[PDB]
């Protein structure tokens, strides 16, 4: 198995414009949304068919109640932050928790918060402490750290529960998450640049670069984003500028899912 991750996000907004939810929560396995909840629907719902098909209605009913509670708690937390920052208007509060199961069998786990889209608090499960970015976060750190049990609980959840959920969902979504669709790769020419283009591939993780005479030229390479094509597969590109005054052997190198390919120009 290659590396996989489980990540759960929360978003709270303190003075949202009309109709827009004050609270939204979404989970992901790798790049795939798997669950959703917001303050408008007030319902926990699957976001992948293999989640819907493997989790019974009592699961959704229970997490619906849990998320209704977590919504209120997020509101209370944001209200407290915005008060301590002495901030008016609409501000955002975010949480992200999750874990990775690496190819080599090792694991990572993480839990962090943001205010107005910037790191606010970051959990260290090895030292059992919170890193605070400013004095508002520092007050919260002091409160959260006062109950040692709460820190221990998060360490356990990140290291044991999160990984168990991830493995559970990886099996549910096996046909999607563990498949491989190799890239179709071509080189286009367009001061003229050579474009190396890949499409049709899954998983989204891919490495594309240009070599000149067998040596890498990272500073002179432009990298395109890995983009969703909309059918479950991804596309990406990389470019370099041609020396009009001297010939060179250029080649595009692509690595995807344990296979390497070279396109010599």
């Amino acid at each position, epitope marked *: 198995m290659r590396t996989h991750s489980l990540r759960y996000f929360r978003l709270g907004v303190s003075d949202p414009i009309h109709g827009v939810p004050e609270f939204i929560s979404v989970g992901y396995v790798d790049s795939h949304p798997i669950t959703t909840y917001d303050s408008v629907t007030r319902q926990k719902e699957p976001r992948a068919p293999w989640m819907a098909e493997n989790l019974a209605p009592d*699961h959704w009913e229970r997490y619906t*109640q*849990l998320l*209704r*509670g977590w919504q*209120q*708690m997020f509101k209370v937390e944001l209200k407290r932050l915005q008060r301590h920052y002495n901030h008016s208007g609409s501000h955002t509060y975010q949480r992200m928790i999750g874990c990775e199961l690496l190819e080599d069998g090792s694991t990572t786990g993480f839990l962090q918060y943001a205010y107005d889209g910037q790191d606010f608090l970051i959990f260290n499960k090895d030292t059992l402490s919170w890193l605070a970015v400013d004095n508002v976060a520092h007050t919260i750190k002091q409160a959260w750290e006062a109950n040692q*049990h709460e820190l*221990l*609980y998060q360490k356990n959840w990140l290291e044991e529960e999160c990984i168990a959920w991830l493995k559970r969902f990886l099996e549910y979504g096996k046909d999607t998450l563990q498949r491989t669709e190799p890239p179709l790769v071509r080189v286009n020419r367009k001061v003229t640049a050579l474009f190396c283009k890949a499409h049709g591939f899954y998983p989204p993780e891919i490495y594309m670069t240009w070599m000149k005479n067998g040596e890498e030229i990272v500073q002179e390479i432009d990298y395109g984003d890995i983009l969703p094509s909309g059918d479950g597969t991804y596309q990406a590109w990389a470019s370099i500028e041609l020396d009009p005054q001297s010939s060179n052997l250029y080649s595009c190198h692509v690595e995807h899912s344990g296979v390497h390919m070279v396109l010599q120009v």
Partner: antibody, heavy 109, light 116 residues
Framework: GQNIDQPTEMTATEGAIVQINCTYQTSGFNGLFWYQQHAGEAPTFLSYNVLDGLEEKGRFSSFLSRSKGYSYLLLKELQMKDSASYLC??????????WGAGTKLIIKP | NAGVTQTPKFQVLKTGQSMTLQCAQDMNHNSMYWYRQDPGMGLRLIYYSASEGTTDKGEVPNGYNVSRLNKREFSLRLESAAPSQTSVYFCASSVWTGEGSGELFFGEGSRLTVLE
């Protein structure tokens, strides 16, 4: 969320030490609690364990081994006022509490 | 400063009779619960309320219903009492639900006996 076991009753002598065992088989694990409940009264929180090891609070200690699915509540220098039921409870993967049937502790003066 | 206050302490009921148990907490908690305790088994959740404005069934909801009247109060209703509902009922609360290591705080309990 499936099974918690603890002995029905235990009897020890004033001044001595008693270890009250709790084993659990649950769907996931988010911590183990002990509660004291005097006859005719409300349960009250005694301890919480979620990582492996021994935690001490006064005359009472609580131990957890997650891999063995096992906890004990240890009471030292028993006094008559320790006569009570001791309830074991585990939080499962969905944060639901699974309660043991309780151990009644009888102290011989 | 009273913690969790539930009433009544004792009640005798005839089969088919209605009964409401009251519970209030002044700890500004968000989560409230109703349990029954019977000989030979662990506490069983009847209904719960993770937050003000929502409620759901526990393990043994049949023959009962609840109202989370406001943040402080969570009433349990026996609409048509049955002898099997002879039990000791416990109200409890916690700061939140499914957040960390938080314990339950219990009411004093309500002993119900239901007779034909």
């Amino acid at each position: 969320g499936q099974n918690i076991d603890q002995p029905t009753e235990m009897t020890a002598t004033e001044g001595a030490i008693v270890q009250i065992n709790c084993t659990y088989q649950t769907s996931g694990f988010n911590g183990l609690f002990w509660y004291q409940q005097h006859a005719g009264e409300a349960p009250t929180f005694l301890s919480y364990n979620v990582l492996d090891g021994l935690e001490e609070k006064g005359r009472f200690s609580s131990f957890l081994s997650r891999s063995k699915g096992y906890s004990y509540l240890l009471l030292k220098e028993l006094q008559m006022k320790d006569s009570a039921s001791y309830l074991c409870a585990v939080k499962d993967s969905n944060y639901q509490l699974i309660w043991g049937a309780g151990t009644k502790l009888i102290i011989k003066p | 400063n009273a913690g969790v206050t539930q009433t009544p302490k004792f009640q005798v009921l005839k089969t088919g009779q209605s009964m409401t148990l009251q519970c209030a907490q002044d700890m500004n908690h968000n989560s409230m619960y109703w349990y029954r305790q019977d000989p030979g088994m662990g506490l069983r959740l009847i209904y719960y309320s993770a937050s003000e404005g929502t409620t759901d069934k526990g393990e043994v909801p049949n023959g009962y219903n609840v109202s989370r009247l406001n943040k402080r109060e969570f009433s349990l209703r026996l609409e048509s009492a049955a002898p099997s509902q002879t039990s000791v009922y416990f109200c409890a609360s916690s700061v939140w639900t499914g957040e960390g290591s938080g314990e339950l705080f219990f009411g004093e309990g309500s002993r119900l006996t239901v007779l034909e």
